[PDB]
Design a protein around this ligand. Structure first.
Ligand SMILES: O=C(O)[C@H]1O[C@@H](O[C@H]2[C@H](O)[C@H](O)[C@H](O[C@H]3[C@H](O)[C@H](O)[C@@H](O)O[C@@H]3C(=O)O)O[C@@H]2C(=O)O)[C@@H](O)[C@@H](O)[C@@H]1O
Ligand SMILES: O=C(O)[C@H]1O[C@@H](O[C@H]2[C@H](O)[C@H](O)[C@H](O[C@H]3[C@H](O)[C@H](O)[C@H](O)O[C@@H]3C(=O)O)O[C@H]2C(=O)O)[C@@H](O)[C@@H](O)[C@@H]1O
Length: 231
């Protein structure tokens, strides 16, 4: 039988601050249900250690969505509220099966758009350089569809071992740290000033697969939203 993620202590803080969306943005499990041992092939404890997400289908997901702690409702914060908003993770991204082309593993999202997606990418060219099997950031600086609405950055080549990430937002600027090294340093998020519906997400969100049957799979060794005010 599949072991529940809540069976160990490692993820209890974030599970107390998240709902699970699967296989779409529809609710799969409340925070209380997650802490109560919710489990399925889409969300289970692997190796007694990893919170593992799995999902197949274009634009489908198995993802945690940041909630107000202790049974609260959906959270919404703003890039310019003066507080530092921080998400941390340690992720083992396995080799992805054929047909999986891009898997979003962490986000900043709002009511209407993704401010940031950190994603594994099979193959893509950025600023004239071709990259394969790597982790990328995509930041929106507008809601348009043209390339000038995005800043896309190679963060790191995918590693077999765990890779640490940290996302920080403060005073309308974004920093991303990968394995302890700042890779994105103060990217401007001021386009989003005044949007008070932002929140963190993490898990697996499957983007533009070439087979809707192909199952994306992502293993978290650690995940947290870090509260700088210590509530
Ligand atoms: O490689 C490129 O830069 C090409 O990307 C195209 O634009 C992307 C855009 O960068 C971004 O990745 C976007 O991401 C969406 C995602 O796939 C999901 O649909 C959902 O999360 O919503 C995201 C979003 O709307 O921001 O997808 C688009 C895309 O068109 O596929 C083009 O800009 C292309 O010209 C460019 O070469
Ligand atoms: O297009 C998407 O799939 C986007 O969905 C987003 O989640 C939303 C979405 O509306 C979802 O159905 C659900 O909405 C709930 C939620 O409780 C909301 O606060 C409202 O009060 O009731 C809705 C309901 O009863 O269905 O969750 C929403 C949310 O913001 O959490 C995100 O998953 C996006 O990432 C996604 O692009």
């Amino acid at each position: 039988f599949l072991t529940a993620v809540s069976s160990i202590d490692t993820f209890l803080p974030v599970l107390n601050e998240a709902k699970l969306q699967w296989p779409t943005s529809a609710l799969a499990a409340s925070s209380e249900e997650l802490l109560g041992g919710y489990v399925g092939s889409q969300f289970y404890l692997q190796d007694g250690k990893y919170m593992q997400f799995q999902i197949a289908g274009s634009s489908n997901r198995c993802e945690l969505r940041q909630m107000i702690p202790d049974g609260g409702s959906e959270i919404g914060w703003a890039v310019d509220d003066g507080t530092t908003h921080t998400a941390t993770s340690s992720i083992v991204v396995p080799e992805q099966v054929d047909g999986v082309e891009e898997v979003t593993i962490m986000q900043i999202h709002s009511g209407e758009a993704p401010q940031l997606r950190i994603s594994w990418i099979r193959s893509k060219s950025l600023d004239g350089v071709a990259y394969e099997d790597f982790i990328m950031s995509t930041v929106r600086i507008g809601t348009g569809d043209s390339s000038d609405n995005f800043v896309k950055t190679h963060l790191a080549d995918r590693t077999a071992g765990a890779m640490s990430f940290q996302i920080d937002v403060k005073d309308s600027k974004l920093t991303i740290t990968v394995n302890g090294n700042v890779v994105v340093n103060g990217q401007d998020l001021s386009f989003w000033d005044g949007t008070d519906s932002c929140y963190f997400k993490a898990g697996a969100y499957n983007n533009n697969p070439t087979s809707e049957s192909a199952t994306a799979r992502i293993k978290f060794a650690a995940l947290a939203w870090v509260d700088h005010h210590h509530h």
